[PDB]
Design a binder for this molecule. Structure first.
Ligand SMILES: Cc1cc2c(cc1C)N(C[C@H](O)[C@H](O)[C@H](O)COP(=O)(O)O)c1[nH]c(=O)[nH]c(=O)c1N2
Ligand SMILES: Cc1cc2c(cc1C)N(C[C@H](O)[C@H](O)[C@H](O)COP(=O)(O)O)c1[nH]c(=O)[nH]c(=O)c1N2
Lengths: 219, 219
């Protein structure tokens, strides 16, 4: 141990800045590839996330080739067609008009998975609450996302697709689970608020009535 | 949109410092209570996390009272011993020596929840996994975890308990689910590396072993 620790005003501002400015990026990806050194720093961030029992259940399968990004994209559509069919009248139109991935456009894609049996037979956290290993994995992702914003790299989480297909296309064991598919690529333009809000799909909720005092539903 | 690019060297360094020094703090929480202005910032960070279909499924229940922390600490006890009994040998006595919560010590606790039904009948980005909603909530948590470090606020995740027992305490309805119970409080010091690694319970896996290329198992 050592060092108390409030950051300086400048450091504090930067952290907040990464937090207040990252976005899910679908259509503004740049073709320029990321250096091996950059990717390492982004995965290095991810790897420094907390994880239940410190089992560090994650794996990152990097995807860089056209054949693969084509099969996955095909896997997206199909899934997205089904999704669309869940909305009627007006909404559907809107849904079917949104951009929900840039699988093809983005140079690098990362498939972050969770090994449901990493470590031993028992473990902390993951005792009566199995989800924790997965939750640990999502933290990994959030970290990547922020470090990415910092690096001027765009990131997009795509979740519209049958896991089995993606697992098959990547040859992932069934004892292993996909937490997230991430599209990555530099970006020079960013929405100043959630795109999904801008395109009028859903607004930002007022935090003030999402916060309770000492007991559920108590303001 | 709006023009955008990488952070400056200085800023970039700040972001990585939060990602690099935050710890699950258990036993070194300080007594002073977080000012209201501070809390709003942390909650603001979490609220600026992404969320499938921009559904924003979270709710935060602030727990500042002793009777509440007492009860929860107890729920923790029950579950933790039960957990303990899943080990044997030095490993059990080992476990039984790890401080795995600061419920009674941290001046503030936050129960981060996930409304499983918010976002209408059928939300965007979901169906090809109904847990993306929970996942989203985690991102909120991780953002809170990171901002807090910059705020010089230690945070620890406590998952060791039977959810229903915690839901009863705070009266959390059925459609909502607990994703995390976070103990917050100012710290005066941090472990330079993960504490479980310091206590020889488990080490940092070598990141190179986890990174694959194009397909599972391929290095
Ligand atoms: C777990 C999870 C999964 C997804 C998302 C998010 C999260 C948290 N998001 C991005 C989502 O739509 C986005 O967070 C909101 O629209 C607001 O984004 P930003 O505030 O700009 O990050 C998303 N976006 C998209 O275009 N296709 C997808 O399949 C998903 N899936
Ligand atoms: C989803 C999830 C859930 C838990 C944790 C983490 C995560 C990601 N951790 C914290 C964990 O023990 C910690 O990550 C490791 O000790 C090392 O990571 P740090 O870098 O120190 O945070 C944790 N710690 C603890 O004392 N009791 C608990 O119930 C849990 N549960």
């Amino acid at each position: 141990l050592t060092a108390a620790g409030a950051f300086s005003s400048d450091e504090r501002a930067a952290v907040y800045r990464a937090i207040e400015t990252r976005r899910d990026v679908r259509d503004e990806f740049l073709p320029e590839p990321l250096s091996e050194e950059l990717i390492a720093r982004l995965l290095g961030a991810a790897h420094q996330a907390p994880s239940v029992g410190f089992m560090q259940p994650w794996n990152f399968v990097l995807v860089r080739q056209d054949e693969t990004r084509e099969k996955v994209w095909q896997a997206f559509q199909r899934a997205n067609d089904e999704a669309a069919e869940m909305f009627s009248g007006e909404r559907q139109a809107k849904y079917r008009s949104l951009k929900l991935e840039g699988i093809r456009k983005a140079p690098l894609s990362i498939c972050v998975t969770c090994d449901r049996t990493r470590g031993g037979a028992v473990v902390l956290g993951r005792t009566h609450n199995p989800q924790m290993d997965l939750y640990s994995t999502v933290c990994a992702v959030q970290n990547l996302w922020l470090a990415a914003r910092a690096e001027g790299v765009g990131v997009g989480w795509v979740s519209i697709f049958h896991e089995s297909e993606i697992k098959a296309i990547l040859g992932i064991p069934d004892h292993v689970e996909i937490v997230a598919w991430l599209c990555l690529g530099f970006v020079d333009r960013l929405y100043q608020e959630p795109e999904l809000a801008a395109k009028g799909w859903r607004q930002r909720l007022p935090l003030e009535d999402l916060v309770f005092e000492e007991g559920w539903g108590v303001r």
